[PDB]
Structures are given as C-alpha cells and as structure tokens.
Symmetry: D2
Subunit: 114 residues, 4 copies
C-alpha cells in the first residue's frame, strides 16, 4: 500500500542504500515509528506496511538525504527530506512517494493509484 522511490539528479541513477523512516502521528501529536528500511539497488523500498496496518492518518516519510550525499563525498544542504501527508480511504489505495535528490534541492511527488 506504501512504496518509496528515490532518484539521484547528479548521477542520473536510483539513490541506493538511502535510509527511510516512516512515522504515524499519534493522538498526542507526537510522531511514532511506523516502518523503515534502506532503498534497494533500484532506489525503491517496498514492504513497509500491509493493508491491515496502513490505516487512515497522518504519516511522515523521512529520507536521510544528508548521509546519502556524505557517503558520495558530497556536501549537502538539507538534514533530511520530509514528506508529510494524510492517507485517506476515499482516495485510491496504493501510494508511491517519490523523491528526486540534488545536493541543495529536492523534488517530491505522490502517485496514488487503484
């Protein structure tokens, strides 16, 4: 129900071995851990959740962009990239959060399909 795809705009490649942490907003307004992983060789992270666990709510996808750039010997601007959104059942059922990274910039989009 939830996939993350990360691309590198400097090298023209998937962004491999990027740490990604997903959080769900709790009733007290704290962010609690939900799912995490490292992007694959294809820059993707699948297997984060199941339909059962992925209930409506506010989620945060934190992509560790600073460590990614540092590992490539490149000095970056951001601490991380943050994508915060509401999962809504009246919308399509599969969510892809994509991000396109540069050292001083990033783009993100959502592809929400049925």
């Amino acid at each position: 129900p939830l996939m993350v795809k990360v691309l590198d705009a400097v090298r023209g490649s998937p962004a491999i071995n990027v740490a990604v942490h997903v959080f769900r907003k709790a009733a007290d307004d704290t962010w609690e851990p939900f799912a995490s992983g490292k992007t694959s060789e294809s820059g993707e992270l699948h297997g984060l959740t199941t339909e059962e666990e992925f209930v409506e709510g506010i989620y945060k996808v934190e992509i560790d962009t600073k460590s990614y750039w540092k590992a490539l010997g490149i000095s970056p601007f951001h601490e991380h990239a943050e994508v915060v959104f509401t999962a809504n059942d009246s919308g399509p059922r599969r969510y892809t959060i994509a991000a396109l990274l540069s050292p001083y910039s990033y783009s993100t989009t959502a592809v929400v399909t049925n």
Copy 2:
C-alpha cells in the same frame, strides 16, 4: 534501451494517453522521426526502440503536454516538453526519461542504468 515515464503533479497520478515523439538528429542538423507512442495507463511508454537501432547520437523526446492538459479541461503554459540528450555507449545501457507535469511547470530527469 529507451523508456519514457510521465507523471501528473496536479492529480497525483500517471499521465495517461500522452503523445510522445522521439527524434534523432541528422547529419544536416534536422530532427528526423525516430519512434513515437502514447503513454499507458501506468504513464509509461516502452517499446520505442531496440538495442540495434538505438545508436549513439543526439535524441529529442517531445512530450505533448498541451494536449494532455487540454483534455483535462486545464489551460497550460507550454506547447510541449522537450528533452534533448546524447546517448553515449560508455555510459550505462538503459535510459529512462521521466517527466513530472504541472500546468505551468515541469521537471525531467534521466535514470541511466546497467
């Protein structure tokens, strides 16, 4: 060896049924037709060329963004989106040209892999 992927930043979806025309630069500096198609339900166009035909050279991928927006009843800025690049054999072998469309803006990136 060549794929095109198009996404819609307004609807959060693949951009479906978008016309895409590929041209190769000729020795006289004219653009000659090379391959074309319409994006699928997943916003992708595969099958454009084969490894045999996709030789080094300068290529232009023209995405008919104006017709796409007009069909959705939305007034857009650009006539089309143009992506012009050199295919180089000393680089990885598969090229994905991706574009992310808005009415007054677009993003494009290349994912070049082995």
Copy 3:
C-alpha cells in the same frame, strides 16, 4: 539573512498569503518557535529574522501548503512542506528557501550566499 519564496505551478504565479513557520532545534532537542510570517503578493517573505538573532543551529522552515491549497478551495496531498537545514555553521550566510507548489508535488531549493 533568511528569505522564503514560494511559486504556484498550477497558476504560474507567486503563491500569495502562504503561512510559514520557522523553528530552531534547542539544546534539549525540541523544536523551538523562531519566527513566522506570510508570503506577500510577490510570493516572498522577508523580515523573519536579524543577523544577530540568526545564530548557528538546525532550522526548520515549515511552509503551510495544505492551508494554501484549501484556501483556494483545492484538496492537496501534503500537510506542509518542511525544509530542515544547518545554518551559519561557517559563519553568517544569507539563505533563500524557495519552493514550487503543485497539489500533489513540490520542489524546494536553497540559495546560499556569503555577504
């Protein structure tokens, strides 16, 4: 020393009246409110801070994109766009945080200059 510029990729215009909240990470790892404002008719927000006040730290620039799209009567994907960065850690710099908004997407960039 800190400016925010926001554009609307749907309308081809500045994004006007966008609320922006800036936080600074405190000693105790919480996010302290630092400054806030709204973009002008030119999509710009200046006057957030001074070079005295804008010390080294980890800053969070929260751009209230959902409130923007909903005030336009549109239902967008993101809650906000957050831009988090270390500032002034090699001395004072001037920062422009720019963002380009669509209902299901945004991009952000930084322009950092040394006065």
Copy 4:
C-alpha cells in the same frame, strides 16, 4: 517583459554565465532568432526584448545547460533545456522563465503577470 532566472541545485547558487537563446516561430514554421544573452551574477537575464518587439507568437527559450556544466568541468546529460510557449495572445504579459539545474535533471516554471 521577458526575464530568465537560472539556479544551480548542486551548489545552491545562481547559475551564472548561462547562455540563453530565444527564438520565435515564423510564418513559414521555422524558428527565427529573437534575442539572446547570458545570466548575470544573480542568475538573471533581463533586457532580452521590449514590449514593442515582444509581439504575440510561439517562443522558444533555449538554456544552454550543457555549456554551463562543461564550463564547470562537469559532463551533464542534457544538451540544453528548451522552454516553448505561446506569449501575448491575450494581450501583453510579463513572463519569467525560471529553471533549476542538476547534471541529470532540470525543472522549469513560468511566472506570468499582467502589468
């Protein structure tokens, strides 16, 4: 009435000294040269045209991104970034064409205002 602004997403800076060529589609469907220039230290190029000269038409703004990256001693993917649009077809407007550059990617947006 026509301005071009270019930023560098690698350095977090204006993209300076970027060559830009503007064309206008002629009666015979060819691309006639219209104006050209280079971005300044602020990544901006003004003074391309006048409101008299900038008549209705289909215009092509070619940003020479490959020459930029190669002058920096970097090998980029694209030959250039081309921005093609109809202008002034409901009367005169002011156009800003902005671009944000990386070696394998770019984004472009337009800001259109009615003076």
